[PDB]
């Protein structure tokens, strides 16, 4: 199922080097969420600080749509190793 859905997406001509297409040729809109985990080592001498966070990016890549409306298929598929995606 999931492995088949992935295979269907990359069996065609997909180039992870090419930017995702847009309807009006506009730019790819990347929504960003950010989760701070820890903020440590606030160095005042070197004026810097350490921080560990979780970066969360979300964009649309019509080329990767498999279910479209879906409602018969899984909402989403976890991308496994060995499958390149424009990022």
């Amino acid at each position, epitope marked *: 199922s999931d492995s088949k859905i992935l295979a269907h997406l990359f069996t065609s001509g997909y180039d992870f080097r090419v930017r995702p297409p847009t309807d009006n040729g*506009g730019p790819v809109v990347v929504s960003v969420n950010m989760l701070l985990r820890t903020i440590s080592k606030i160095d005042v001498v070197n004026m810097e600080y350490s921080a560990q966070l979780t970066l969360r990016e979300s964009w649309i890549d019509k080329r990767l749509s498999y279910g479209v409306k879906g409602d018969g298929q899984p909402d989403f598929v976890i991308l496994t190793v060995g499958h390149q995606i424009w990022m």
Partner: antibody
Amino acid sequence: EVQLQQSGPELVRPGASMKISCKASGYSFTGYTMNWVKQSHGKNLEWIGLINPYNGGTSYNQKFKGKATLTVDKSSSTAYMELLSLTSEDSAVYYCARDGDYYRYGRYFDYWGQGTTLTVSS
Amino acid sequence: QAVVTQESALTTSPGETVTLTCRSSTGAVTTINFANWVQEKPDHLFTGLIGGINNRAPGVPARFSGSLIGDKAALTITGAQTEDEAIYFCALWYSNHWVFGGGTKLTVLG
């Protein structure tokens, strides 16, 4: 108060090339990027390009690529605009409009100049 | 290519609420269009009102306000004033450049 005073009106023959100025005052000149707008009688408002005083960096409208050349003189807080190969179509009023954000691009207009009227006719 | 469209002209009385709209030909006006609104008083006096994400020019009265009503950019003057009578241009950002509209000639009736 901030002010953008542009050069006076100019009359030039086709084929020639002239340069209009925009002297900024009342604000840290090198902190706000400048836009150039062309208001012609035949068309609407057109966006020519923009320049970052601090950076020297420029970005032109594909339309005016080669027609306009944005520069800047930090010492005199003045933004200049060259116009090459002037023709009938270049007869318009050229405004200079400041961007809104402080040392960053905000994509919104603050103050404009009074405008410079360029008349090109042989 | 891409064209911006505005009402040729609009009319309103002092105190009322008028709304100018800005339409994109490529589709719905989204946030990455950074809809800008510029005012032109007589004798070539241009000044910015709204733009960018949701920021405004210095001194722009509180009555002015921007939004994305429907699928086009809007500019709403709540409590129109006499001096508010001018030509309003809206500008959309398409990828790497600005595109202006035809402008709307707002008349505050006298």
